[PDB]
């Protein structure tokens, strides 16, 4: 019964529909998110952002906890799934999942090879939330799918990693907006 | 009088029972089968494979030809239905059917909006077999409900399309196993 | 200049790197390869497979033909050496080598006590190739290090042997994948 997420058109987000995730801050805040690849890892891909603010990157589909509700709502666990237009360099999934700890960088990366559905301990790292706290719109990884589980619980922001703007768990979240692909 | 189809626990598949159909090839081979959709088509949904080795996708149920036989057995026509709860179905069934020839890709696709029961020409595109082949079980479309009919016949393999892994008719079938739900 | 062999991570296999070699078929396909010992023979250790698909086994390292090309490539001869992080139970090597003909089983076993390097007649039994079919990858024994020599040329598969999953020459090769250690 939560408040709907809204795209730039004022329209409430629909699960299954494709949306560009674009920086709410343009200029040096960059453009949209898309799939990139690391130098020491060709697969699975990683969530990156384009330097150009005219680039909206790769759209995503949101998969609900209970898909009986087709409205994407705030502070609710869901799966974010990149839906690329290019051919797949990788045979692993393009679903967002929280990586394990990166001892070389000190940040929890947001990466691919996540899971659609199966809420519970097996998929704890595949569930994300959208909020609007002190930002335009932010991603928060704090899955409530498993009440006996212990999970990380914090905002999701951007950090520089080897020439790419990557997404990592951060205290100071980063603001986004949603755009119907059409 | 054929031999039954077994699941991961060694227990034969039951018609009416729920089973995850998971690729016997892990890693790059992806995992279980589930339901997806195309950019230009919202319904009926399409049969896809989740790419992660830790998600089994969507469970299925088997309907035998004879509704009285409870055992799922090899080299015999059956109905396969997904059993999801997504309310994004535009009332189309969850039963596997063979699509008509896709002129764009040159492949015969596997889809939904098939029919349970009613063996005959009407449900021709909805009847599937499981063959052992060489690896774990492979799916095969070769309906035997209409002797008078001209149907395609070949194994079922996997092929890429629109950023999703899909099921099509081919000679080299793709292997799968079954995990009880 | 052949295409590089790729591990699970999408990475071309590098000569010298520890890799786990694990069945590309999970479930009853078992797991990884390791050093085992037979009932009547303690040395040399043989190549075996752990029944649990969770046991990646013993890491190994590749040894190319030309000691300077670091890219492990397809259809190219190489030595293979087990890397037991366990204490070495024997004085013979961990290098893969085709055992002599087993009159009791009609199987050309894969054992150890092979030799790294010295291509030609002296080490013909330690030179293996990697290829791919419909599965991830399949081993093949068809060394080219001696043109005037006659050797068997066939794929490599798995067989039971006193309750241990050994490896031997076959016409259909078993599928594997490589995970960085």
Short mmCIF file of C-alpha atoms in Angstrom, two decimals:
data_model
loop_
_atom_site.label_atom_id
_atom_site.label_comp_id
_atom_site.label_asym_id
_atom_site.label_seq_id
_atom_site.Cartn_x
_atom_site.Cartn_y
_atom_site.Cartn_z
CA UNK A 1 0.00 0.00 0.00
CA UNK A 2 3.11 2.17 -0.37
CA UNK A 3 3.41 5.33 -2.45
CA UNK A 4 4.17 4.69 -6.15
CA UNK A 5 7.52 5.54 -7.67
CA UNK A 6 7.15 8.16 -10.40
CA UNK A 7 9.05 8.60 -13.65
CA UNK A 8 9.87 11.94 -15.29
CA UNK A 9 6.43 12.01 -16.95
CA UNK A 10 4.68 12.00 -13.56
CA UNK A 11 3.54 8.44 -14.29
CA UNK A 12 3.74 5.71 -11.66
CA UNK A 13 6.25 2.99 -12.51
CA UNK A 14 4.94 -0.32 -13.87
CA UNK A 15 6.68 -3.61 -13.17
CA UNK A 16 7.79 -5.24 -16.39
CA UNK A 17 8.06 -1.93 -18.24
CA UNK A 18 11.49 -0.73 -19.33
CA UNK A 19 12.96 2.44 -17.81
CA UNK A 20 16.23 4.24 -18.32
CA UNK A 21 17.78 5.04 -14.94
CA UNK A 22 19.31 8.48 -15.51
CA UNK A 23 21.27 10.74 -13.16
CA UNK A 24 19.09 13.34 -11.47
CA UNK A 25 22.24 15.53 -11.54
CA UNK A 26 23.46 16.25 -15.08
CA UNK A 27 26.71 17.80 -16.29
CA UNK A 28 29.42 16.12 -14.21
CA UNK A 29 26.81 14.02 -12.41
CA UNK A 30 26.77 11.94 -15.59
CA UNK A 31 24.01 10.33 -17.59
CA UNK A 32 22.35 6.95 -17.17
CA UNK A 33 23.38 3.52 -15.95
CA UNK A 34 24.34 0.69 -18.29
CA UNK A 35 26.33 -2.54 -18.43
CA UNK A 36 30.11 -2.31 -18.48
CA UNK A 37 32.83 -4.87 -18.01
CA UNK A 38 35.95 -4.93 -15.85
CA UNK A 39 39.47 -5.61 -17.06
CA UNK A 40 40.05 -8.62 -14.76
CA UNK A 41 36.49 -9.93 -15.23
CA UNK A 42 34.75 -10.25 -18.58
CA UNK A 43 31.71 -11.95 -17.00
CA UNK A 44 29.50 -11.23 -15.17
CA UNK A 45 29.11 -7.59 -16.20
CA UNK A 46 28.95 -4.65 -13.78
CA UNK A 47 26.65 -1.66 -13.35
CA UNK A 48 28.40 1.48 -14.66
CA UNK A 49 27.38 4.98 -15.71
CA UNK A 50 28.16 6.93 -18.87
CA UNK A 51 30.23 10.09 -18.53
CA UNK A 52 28.09 11.90 -21.10
CA UNK A 53 24.83 13.24 -19.62
CA UNK A 54 23.08 12.80 -22.99
CA UNK A 55 23.51 9.01 -22.67
CA UNK A 56 20.69 7.18 -20.86
CA UNK A 57 22.53 3.85 -20.92
CA UNK A 58 20.59 0.60 -20.72
CA UNK A 59 16.93 0.38 -19.60
CA UNK A 60 15.76 -1.87 -16.78
CA UNK A 61 12.69 -3.89 -15.85
CA UNK A 62 11.57 -4.10 -12.23
CA UNK A 63 10.29 -7.45 -10.96
CA UNK A 64 8.03 -7.27 -7.92
CA UNK A 65 8.03 -9.40 -4.78
CA UNK A 66 4.36 -10.26 -5.35
CA UNK A 67 3.79 -9.59 -9.05
CA UNK A 68 0.04 -9.33 -8.41
CA UNK A 69 0.91 -5.64 -7.92
CA UNK A 70 2.15 -4.10 -11.18
CA UNK A 71 3.01 -0.75 -9.54
CA UNK A 72 6.62 -0.12 -8.48
CA UNK A 73 6.44 1.42 -5.00
CA UNK A 74 8.90 3.10 -2.67
CA UNK A 75 10.91 1.33 0.05
CA UNK A 76 9.90 -2.09 -1.28
CA UNK A 77 12.10 -5.05 -2.15
CA UNK A 78 12.30 -5.71 -5.90
CA UNK A 79 14.66 -7.02 -8.56
CA UNK A 80 16.23 -4.61 -11.05
CA UNK A 81 17.06 -6.24 -14.39
CA UNK A 82 19.06 -4.61 -17.18
CA UNK A 83 17.42 -5.13 -20.56
CA UNK A 84 20.18 -4.45 -23.09
CA UNK A 85 19.86 -3.58 -26.76
CA UNK A 86 23.32 -4.97 -27.67
CA UNK A 87 24.20 -8.66 -28.01
CA UNK A 88 25.09 -10.43 -24.78
CA UNK A 89 28.84 -10.64 -24.23
CA UNK A 90 28.04 -12.82 -21.20
CA UNK A 91 25.86 -15.85 -20.48
CA UNK A 92 25.20 -14.76 -16.88
CA UNK A 93 22.09 -12.84 -15.90
CA UNK A 94 21.76 -9.05 -15.97
CA UNK A 95 19.89 -8.89 -12.63
CA UNK A 96 21.30 -6.59 -9.97
CA UNK A 97 22.93 -8.36 -7.05
CA UNK A 98 25.14 -7.13 -4.21
CA UNK A 99 28.65 -8.54 -4.59
CA UNK A 100 30.76 -9.84 -1.74
CA UNK A 101 33.16 -7.47 -0.01
CA UNK A 102 35.94 -6.04 -2.20
CA UNK A 103 39.00 -6.07 0.07
CA UNK A 104 40.97 -4.13 -2.57
CA UNK A 105 38.56 -1.16 -2.59
CA UNK A 106 36.57 -1.27 0.66
CA UNK A 107 33.19 -0.94 -1.05
CA UNK A 108 30.26 -3.27 -1.67
CA UNK A 109 29.76 -3.23 -5.43
CA UNK A 110 26.41 -3.53 -7.18
CA UNK A 111 26.90 -6.16 -9.88
CA UNK A 112 24.97 -8.51 -12.17
CA UNK A 113 24.11 -12.25 -12.13
CA UNK A 114 21.27 -11.67 -9.67
CA UNK A 115 17.97 -13.51 -9.31
CA UNK A 116 14.40 -12.78 -10.35
CA UNK A 117 12.04 -14.11 -7.72
CA UNK A 118 12.56 -16.69 -4.99
CA UNK A 119 12.55 -14.20 -2.09
CA UNK A 120 14.48 -15.58 0.86
CA UNK A 121 18.02 -16.34 2.04
CA UNK A 122 19.13 -17.74 -1.33
CA UNK A 123 18.37 -14.45 -3.09
CA UNK A 124 19.03 -11.94 -0.29
CA UNK A 125 21.56 -10.06 -2.43
CA UNK A 126 19.13 -9.62 -5.36
CA UNK A 127 16.53 -7.37 -3.67
CA UNK A 128 16.64 -3.57 -3.84
CA UNK A 129 14.49 -0.61 -2.76
CA UNK A 130 13.79 2.91 -4.02
CA UNK A 131 13.50 5.85 -1.61
CA UNK A 132 13.40 9.67 -1.88
CA UNK A 133 15.28 10.70 1.28
CA UNK A 134 17.22 13.97 0.86
CA UNK A 135 17.69 13.05 -2.83
CA UNK A 136 15.55 13.00 -5.94
CA UNK A 137 15.36 9.19 -5.96
CA UNK A 138 17.85 6.73 -4.48
CA UNK A 139 18.52 3.00 -4.40
CA UNK A 140 18.74 1.37 -0.96
CA UNK A 141 19.83 -2.24 -0.42
CA UNK A 142 18.03 -3.40 2.73
CA UNK A 143 16.00 -6.52 1.88
CA UNK A 144 13.20 -7.41 4.29
CA UNK A 145 12.59 -10.75 2.54
CA UNK A 146 14.13 -12.74 5.43
CA UNK A 147 13.27 -11.45 8.90
CA UNK A 148 15.71 -13.83 10.61
CA UNK A 149 18.56 -12.86 8.28
CA UNK A 150 21.19 -10.20 8.91
CA UNK A 151 21.69 -7.93 5.92
CA UNK A 152 23.61 -4.83 5.02
CA UNK A 153 21.34 -1.79 5.15
CA UNK A 154 22.46 1.51 3.60
CA UNK A 155 22.11 3.83 0.62
CA UNK A 156 23.69 3.15 -2.78
CA UNK A 157 25.93 5.78 -4.36
CA UNK A 158 28.65 6.12 -6.99
CA UNK A 159 32.43 5.76 -6.75
CA UNK A 160 35.30 5.74 -9.22
CA UNK A 161 36.77 2.33 -10.00
CA UNK A 162 39.44 1.86 -12.68
CA UNK A 163 38.18 4.46 -15.13
CA UNK A 164 34.51 3.53 -14.64
CA UNK A 165 31.82 5.09 -12.47
CA UNK A 166 30.61 2.10 -10.46
CA UNK A 167 27.78 1.71 -7.98
CA UNK A 168 28.62 0.84 -4.38
CA UNK A 169 26.91 0.84 -1.01
CA UNK A 170 27.43 4.32 0.41
CA UNK A 171 26.06 6.49 3.17
CA UNK A 172 25.57 9.46 0.82
CA UNK A 173 23.24 8.01 -1.79
CA UNK A 174 23.03 9.20 -5.34
CA UNK A 175 19.88 10.68 -6.91
CA UNK A 176 18.28 9.19 -10.01
CA UNK A 177 15.22 9.56 -12.23
CA UNK A 178 13.31 7.07 -14.37
CA UNK A 179 12.44 7.43 -18.06
CA UNK A 180 10.12 5.25 -20.14
CA UNK A 181 12.09 3.80 -23.06
CA UNK A 182 9.34 4.13 -25.72
CA UNK B 1 5.14 -49.37 -21.62
CA UNK B 2 8.10 -46.99 -21.54
CA UNK B 3 10.41 -46.03 -18.59
CA UNK B 4 9.61 -43.13 -16.26
CA UNK B 5 11.36 -39.76 -16.11
CA UNK B 6 13.30 -39.18 -12.88
CA UNK B 7 14.11 -36.03 -10.93
CA UNK B 8 17.27 -34.99 -9.05
CA UNK B 9 16.35 -37.00 -5.95
CA UNK B 10 16.00 -40.16 -8.09
CA UNK B 11 12.20 -40.08 -7.80
CA UNK B 12 10.10 -40.43 -10.94
CA UNK B 13 8.16 -37.42 -12.19
CA UNK B 14 4.45 -37.36 -11.30
CA UNK B 15 1.80 -35.82 -13.53
CA UNK B 16 0.26 -33.01 -11.51
CA UNK B 17 3.41 -32.54 -9.40
CA UNK B 18 5.54 -29.39 -9.51
CA UNK B 19 9.12 -29.61 -10.80
CA UNK B 20 11.81 -27.07 -11.61
CA UNK B 21 13.24 -27.81 -15.07
CA UNK B 22 16.91 -26.89 -14.57
CA UNK B 23 19.70 -27.05 -17.14
CA UNK B 24 21.90 -30.05 -16.41
CA UNK B 25 24.75 -27.87 -17.72
CA UNK B 26 25.60 -25.28 -15.08
CA UNK B 27 27.88 -22.25 -15.24
CA UNK B 28 27.53 -20.69 -18.69
CA UNK B 29 24.68 -23.13 -19.40
CA UNK B 30 22.36 -21.14 -17.16
CA UNK B 31 19.81 -22.61 -14.81
CA UNK B 32 16.10 -23.29 -14.73
CA UNK B 33 13.30 -22.32 -17.08
CA UNK B 34 10.90 -19.46 -16.40
CA UNK B 35 8.59 -16.99 -18.15
CA UNK B 36 9.63 -13.83 -19.92
CA UNK B 37 8.27 -11.37 -22.46
CA UNK B 38 9.40 -9.66 -25.65
CA UNK B 39 9.84 -5.97 -26.41
CA UNK B 40 7.05 -5.98 -29.04
CA UNK B 41 4.82 -8.61 -27.37
CA UNK B 42 3.54 -8.43 -23.80
CA UNK B 43 1.30 -11.52 -23.99
CA UNK B 44 1.28 -14.45 -24.30
CA UNK B 45 4.54 -14.81 -22.37
CA UNK B 46 7.47 -16.86 -23.66
CA UNK B 47 9.57 -19.74 -22.33
CA UNK B 48 13.02 -18.51 -21.26
CA UNK B 49 15.96 -19.69 -19.16
CA UNK B 50 17.21 -17.75 -16.16
CA UNK B 51 20.94 -17.23 -16.67
CA UNK B 52 22.00 -17.76 -13.03
CA UNK B 53 23.02 -21.16 -11.68
CA UNK B 54 21.36 -20.41 -8.31
CA UNK B 55 17.80 -19.60 -9.50
CA UNK B 56 15.72 -22.47 -10.87
CA UNK B 57 13.26 -20.15 -12.62
CA UNK B 58 9.63 -21.23 -12.67
CA UNK B 59 8.21 -24.66 -11.79
CA UNK B 60 6.15 -26.70 -14.25
CA UNK B 61 3.52 -29.42 -14.06
CA UNK B 62 2.97 -32.29 -16.52
CA UNK B 63 -0.40 -33.48 -17.78
CA UNK B 64 -0.34 -36.96 -19.24
CA UNK B 65 -2.26 -37.86 -22.38
CA UNK B 66 -4.25 -40.43 -20.40
CA UNK B 67 -5.36 -38.45 -17.34
CA UNK B 68 -5.41 -41.76 -15.42
CA UNK B 69 -1.69 -42.60 -15.63
CA UNK B 70 0.18 -40.81 -12.84
CA UNK B 71 3.73 -41.55 -14.03
CA UNK B 72 5.65 -39.23 -16.36
CA UNK B 73 7.44 -41.53 -18.81
CA UNK B 74 9.81 -41.16 -21.75
CA UNK B 75 9.09 -40.89 -25.48
CA UNK B 76 5.45 -39.98 -24.86
CA UNK B 77 3.41 -36.87 -25.61
CA UNK B 78 2.40 -34.69 -22.66
CA UNK B 79 1.32 -31.18 -21.73
CA UNK B 80 3.69 -28.85 -19.88
CA UNK B 81 2.26 -25.89 -17.99
CA UNK B 82 4.09 -23.27 -16.02
CA UNK B 83 2.33 -22.50 -12.74
CA UNK B 84 3.23 -18.90 -11.82
CA UNK B 85 1.44 -16.10 -9.98
CA UNK B 86 2.46 -13.15 -12.17
CA UNK B 87 -0.66 -11.16 -12.95
CA UNK B 88 0.91 -9.80 -16.16
CA UNK B 89 -0.75 -12.65 -18.09
CA UNK B 90 -3.27 -11.25 -20.54
CA UNK B 91 -5.48 -14.29 -19.79
CA UNK B 92 -3.38 -16.56 -22.01
CA UNK B 93 -2.77 -20.05 -20.70
CA UNK B 94 0.48 -21.18 -19.08
CA UNK B 95 0.66 -24.35 -21.22
CA UNK B 96 3.59 -24.97 -23.57
CA UNK B 97 2.77 -24.68 -27.26
CA UNK B 98 4.83 -24.55 -30.44
CA UNK B 99 4.67 -21.17 -32.15
CA UNK B 100 4.20 -20.74 -35.87
CA UNK B 101 7.25 -20.19 -38.06
CA UNK B 102 9.05 -16.99 -37.08
CA UNK B 103 10.00 -15.49 -40.44
CA UNK B 104 12.36 -13.04 -38.73
CA UNK B 105 14.74 -15.57 -37.15
CA UNK B 106 14.09 -18.79 -39.08
CA UNK B 107 13.37 -20.79 -35.92
CA UNK B 108 10.33 -22.56 -34.48
CA UNK B 109 9.88 -21.11 -31.00
CA UNK B 110 8.48 -22.57 -27.78
CA UNK B 111 5.74 -20.46 -26.20
CA UNK B 112 2.61 -20.58 -24.06
CA UNK B 113 -1.14 -20.43 -24.78
CA UNK B 114 -1.18 -24.19 -25.30
CA UNK B 115 -3.94 -26.60 -24.35
CA UNK B 116 -4.18 -29.27 -21.67
CA UNK B 117 -5.84 -32.44 -22.88
CA UNK B 118 -7.94 -32.85 -26.01
CA UNK B 119 -5.51 -35.03 -28.00
CA UNK B 120 -5.93 -34.49 -31.72
CA UNK B 121 -5.26 -32.01 -34.52
CA UNK B 122 -6.54 -29.12 -32.41
CA UNK B 123 -3.90 -29.45 -29.67
CA UNK B 124 -1.14 -30.65 -32.01
CA UNK B 125 1.26 -27.81 -31.17
CA UNK B 126 0.82 -28.46 -27.40
CA UNK B 127 2.08 -32.05 -27.04
CA UNK B 128 5.71 -32.71 -26.12
CA UNK B 129 7.97 -35.68 -25.45
CA UNK B 130 10.98 -36.19 -23.20
CA UNK B 131 13.78 -38.23 -24.76
CA UNK B 132 16.81 -39.46 -22.84
CA UNK B 133 19.21 -38.83 -25.71
CA UNK B 134 22.84 -38.90 -24.58
CA UNK B 135 22.99 -36.46 -21.65
CA UNK B 136 20.27 -35.77 -19.10
CA UNK B 137 16.74 -35.47 -20.45
CA UNK B 138 16.06 -33.46 -23.61
CA UNK B 139 12.72 -32.06 -24.77
CA UNK B 140 11.37 -32.99 -28.19
CA UNK B 141 8.30 -31.83 -30.11
CA UNK B 142 6.94 -34.76 -32.08
CA UNK B 143 3.19 -35.08 -31.45
CA UNK B 144 1.60 -38.52 -31.75
CA UNK B 145 -2.02 -37.47 -31.08
CA UNK B 146 -2.89 -37.14 -34.80
CA UNK B 147 -1.60 -39.91 -37.08
CA UNK B 148 -3.24 -38.19 -40.07
CA UNK B 149 -1.27 -34.98 -39.48
CA UNK B 150 1.92 -33.53 -40.95
CA UNK B 151 3.91 -32.12 -38.03
CA UNK B 152 7.47 -31.01 -37.64
CA UNK B 153 9.60 -33.34 -35.53
CA UNK B 154 12.93 -32.55 -33.86
CA UNK B 155 14.65 -32.16 -30.51
CA UNK B 156 14.38 -28.86 -28.62
CA UNK B 157 17.48 -26.77 -27.93
CA UNK B 158 18.32 -23.25 -26.75
CA UNK B 159 19.12 -20.19 -28.87
CA UNK B 160 19.62 -16.52 -28.12
CA UNK B 161 17.16 -13.75 -28.98
CA UNK B 162 16.63 -10.15 -27.79
CA UNK B 163 18.92 -10.47 -24.79
CA UNK B 164 17.14 -13.62 -23.61
CA UNK B 165 17.83 -17.34 -23.93
CA UNK B 166 14.88 -19.07 -25.62
CA UNK B 167 13.78 -22.57 -26.62
CA UNK B 168 13.50 -23.60 -30.26
CA UNK B 169 13.38 -26.66 -32.49
CA UNK B 170 16.83 -28.05 -33.33
CA UNK B 171 18.69 -31.29 -33.89
CA UNK B 172 21.02 -31.11 -30.87
CA UNK B 173 18.73 -31.11 -27.86
CA UNK B 174 19.68 -29.30 -24.70
CA UNK B 175 19.90 -31.36 -21.49
CA UNK B 176 17.81 -30.76 -18.38
CA UNK B 177 17.04 -32.31 -15.01
CA UNK B 178 14.10 -31.96 -12.64
CA UNK B 179 14.05 -30.78 -9.02
CA UNK B 180 10.90 -31.34 -6.97
CA UNK B 181 9.25 -28.12 -5.76
CA UNK C 1 47.08 -18.55 -32.72
CA UNK C 2 44.09 -20.72 -31.82
CA UNK C 3 41.21 -19.40 -29.74
CA UNK C 4 41.94 -19.08 -26.00
CA UNK C 5 40.48 -21.53 -23.50
CA UNK C 6 38.08 -19.68 -21.20
CA UNK C 7 37.44 -20.38 -17.51
CA UNK C 8 34.15 -19.78 -15.66
CA UNK C 9 34.93 -16.07 -15.24
CA UNK C 10 35.07 -15.38 -19.01
CA UNK C 11 38.87 -15.25 -18.78
CA UNK C 12 41.29 -16.93 -21.15
CA UNK C 13 43.16 -19.70 -19.36
CA UNK C 14 46.69 -18.70 -18.39
CA UNK C 15 49.60 -21.11 -18.32
CA UNK C 16 50.85 -21.40 -14.74
CA UNK C 17 47.61 -20.45 -12.99
CA UNK C 18 45.96 -22.82 -10.54
CA UNK C 19 42.55 -23.92 -11.83
CA UNK C 20 39.94 -26.33 -10.52
CA UNK C 21 38.56 -28.60 -13.26
CA UNK C 22 34.95 -29.46 -12.49
CA UNK C 23 32.22 -31.37 -14.34
CA UNK C 24 30.11 -29.02 -16.45
CA UNK C 25 27.23 -31.36 -15.51
CA UNK C 26 26.12 -30.96 -11.90
CA UNK C 27 23.96 -33.25 -9.79
CA UNK C 28 24.90 -36.81 -10.74
CA UNK C 29 27.71 -35.38 -12.88
CA UNK C 30 29.78 -34.99 -9.71
CA UNK C 31 32.36 -32.32 -9.08
CA UNK C 32 36.07 -31.76 -9.59
CA UNK C 33 39.13 -33.89 -10.23
CA UNK C 34 41.60 -34.86 -7.51
CA UNK C 35 44.41 -37.24 -6.59
CA UNK C 36 43.10 -40.64 -5.55
CA UNK C 37 44.64 -44.02 -4.78
CA UNK C 38 43.61 -47.52 -5.83
CA UNK C 39 43.18 -50.67 -3.77
CA UNK C 40 46.27 -52.52 -5.04
CA UNK C 41 48.36 -49.47 -6.04
CA UNK C 42 49.38 -46.61 -3.78
CA UNK C 43 51.83 -44.99 -6.23
CA UNK C 44 51.43 -43.30 -8.66
CA UNK C 45 48.19 -41.57 -7.65
CA UNK C 46 45.41 -41.64 -10.20
CA UNK C 47 43.06 -38.93 -11.42
CA UNK C 48 39.63 -39.33 -9.81
CA UNK C 49 36.39 -37.38 -9.39
CA UNK C 50 34.67 -36.61 -6.09
CA UNK C 51 31.02 -37.64 -6.09
CA UNK C 52 29.86 -34.43 -4.39
CA UNK C 53 29.42 -31.70 -6.99
CA UNK C 54 30.53 -29.39 -4.14
CA UNK C 55 34.09 -30.80 -4.03
CA UNK C 56 36.13 -28.95 -6.66
CA UNK C 57 38.97 -31.37 -5.85
CA UNK C 58 42.66 -30.59 -6.32
CA UNK C 59 43.82 -27.51 -8.27
CA UNK C 60 46.04 -28.07 -11.30
CA UNK C 61 48.42 -26.11 -13.53
CA UNK C 62 48.86 -26.25 -17.32
CA UNK C 63 52.24 -26.47 -19.05
CA UNK C 64 52.21 -25.30 -22.67
CA UNK C 65 54.33 -26.57 -25.55
CA UNK C 66 56.25 -23.32 -26.06
CA UNK C 67 57.23 -22.09 -22.59
CA UNK C 68 56.62 -18.44 -23.60
CA UNK C 69 53.03 -18.41 -24.90
CA UNK C 70 51.04 -17.93 -21.68
CA UNK C 71 47.63 -18.38 -23.35
CA UNK C 72 46.13 -21.85 -22.96
CA UNK C 73 44.60 -22.49 -26.37
CA UNK C 74 42.44 -25.13 -28.03
CA UNK C 75 43.66 -28.23 -29.88
CA UNK C 76 47.20 -27.64 -28.65
CA UNK C 77 49.40 -30.07 -26.74
CA UNK C 78 50.13 -29.40 -23.07
CA UNK C 79 51.15 -31.17 -19.91
CA UNK C 80 48.81 -31.11 -16.92
CA UNK C 81 49.99 -31.27 -13.31
CA UNK C 82 47.91 -31.75 -10.17
CA UNK C 83 48.70 -29.23 -7.44
CA UNK C 84 47.94 -31.04 -4.15
CA UNK C 85 47.74 -28.57 -1.30
CA UNK C 86 47.67 -31.89 0.58
CA UNK C 87 50.96 -33.58 1.44
CA UNK C 88 52.30 -35.59 -1.47
CA UNK C 89 51.54 -39.24 -0.73
CA UNK C 90 53.98 -40.55 -3.38
CA UNK C 91 57.38 -40.17 -5.03
CA UNK C 92 55.89 -40.33 -8.54
CA UNK C 93 54.58 -37.18 -10.19
CA UNK C 94 51.17 -35.52 -10.33
CA UNK C 95 51.61 -34.95 -14.08
CA UNK C 96 48.84 -36.47 -16.18
CA UNK C 97 49.86 -39.42 -18.33
CA UNK C 98 47.88 -42.08 -20.16
CA UNK C 99 48.35 -45.42 -18.41
CA UNK C 100 49.20 -48.55 -20.38
CA UNK C 101 46.41 -50.72 -21.75
CA UNK C 102 44.33 -52.31 -18.98
CA UNK C 103 43.59 -55.85 -20.20
CA UNK C 104 41.13 -56.33 -17.32
CA UNK C 105 38.89 -53.40 -18.33
CA UNK C 106 39.79 -52.48 -21.92
CA UNK C 107 40.41 -48.93 -20.72
CA UNK C 108 43.29 -46.54 -21.37
CA UNK C 109 43.30 -45.01 -17.92
CA UNK C 110 44.46 -41.54 -16.99
CA UNK C 111 47.02 -41.78 -14.20
CA UNK C 112 49.90 -39.63 -12.97
CA UNK C 113 53.72 -39.99 -13.10
CA UNK C 114 53.75 -38.04 -16.35
CA UNK C 115 56.48 -35.66 -17.46
CA UNK C 116 56.38 -31.91 -18.04
CA UNK C 117 58.23 -30.87 -21.17
CA UNK C 118 60.62 -32.59 -23.57
CA UNK C 119 58.17 -32.95 -26.49
CA UNK C 120 58.63 -36.09 -28.55
CA UNK C 121 58.71 -39.86 -28.00
CA UNK C 122 59.91 -39.78 -24.38
CA UNK C 123 56.92 -37.75 -23.12
CA UNK C 124 54.22 -38.58 -25.69
CA UNK C 125 51.92 -39.86 -22.94
CA UNK C 126 51.82 -36.51 -21.08
CA UNK C 127 50.56 -34.31 -23.95
CA UNK C 128 46.84 -33.50 -23.97
CA UNK C 129 44.47 -31.22 -25.87
CA UNK C 130 41.30 -29.34 -24.93
CA UNK C 131 38.39 -29.02 -27.36
CA UNK C 132 34.69 -28.15 -27.18
CA UNK C 133 31.51 -29.70 -28.51
CA UNK C 134 27.92 -29.04 -27.49
CA UNK C 135 29.08 -28.83 -23.85
CA UNK C 136 31.54 -26.58 -22.04
CA UNK C 137 34.81 -28.38 -22.83
CA UNK C 138 36.01 -31.92 -23.47
CA UNK C 139 39.49 -33.37 -23.05
CA UNK C 140 41.21 -35.14 -25.94
CA UNK C 141 44.41 -37.18 -26.13
CA UNK C 142 45.96 -36.72 -29.58
CA UNK C 143 49.49 -35.38 -29.05
CA UNK C 144 51.31 -33.89 -32.03
CA UNK C 145 54.77 -33.65 -30.42
CA UNK C 146 56.13 -36.48 -32.60
CA UNK C 147 55.10 -36.58 -36.26
CA UNK C 148 56.71 -39.97 -36.96
CA UNK C 149 55.01 -41.52 -33.91
CA UNK C 150 51.76 -43.48 -33.78
CA UNK C 151 49.45 -42.76 -30.86
CA UNK C 152 45.79 -43.09 -30.02
CA UNK C 153 43.59 -40.17 -31.02
CA UNK C 154 40.30 -40.05 -29.12
CA UNK C 155 38.31 -38.01 -26.62
CA UNK C 156 38.49 -38.54 -22.83
CA UNK C 157 35.63 -39.58 -20.55
CA UNK C 158 34.77 -40.97 -17.10
CA UNK C 159 34.34 -44.54 -15.86
CA UNK C 160 33.69 -46.25 -12.55
CA UNK C 161 36.56 -48.28 -11.13
CA UNK C 162 36.29 -49.98 -7.70
CA UNK C 163 33.90 -47.27 -6.60
CA UNK C 164 36.20 -44.44 -7.76
CA UNK C 165 35.39 -42.16 -10.70
CA UNK C 166 38.46 -42.59 -12.89
CA UNK C 167 39.15 -41.15 -16.34
CA UNK C 168 40.02 -43.01 -19.55
CA UNK C 169 40.09 -42.68 -23.32
CA UNK C 170 36.60 -42.61 -24.86
CA UNK C 171 35.06 -41.60 -28.17
CA UNK C 172 32.71 -39.17 -26.37
CA UNK C 173 34.45 -36.75 -24.01
CA UNK C 174 33.06 -35.69 -20.65
CA UNK C 175 32.34 -31.96 -20.15
CA UNK C 176 34.32 -29.76 -17.78
CA UNK C 177 34.79 -26.13 -16.78
CA UNK C 178 37.63 -24.23 -15.11
CA UNK C 179 37.44 -22.11 -11.94
CA UNK C 180 40.29 -19.89 -10.75
CA UNK C 181 41.72 -21.01 -7.40
#
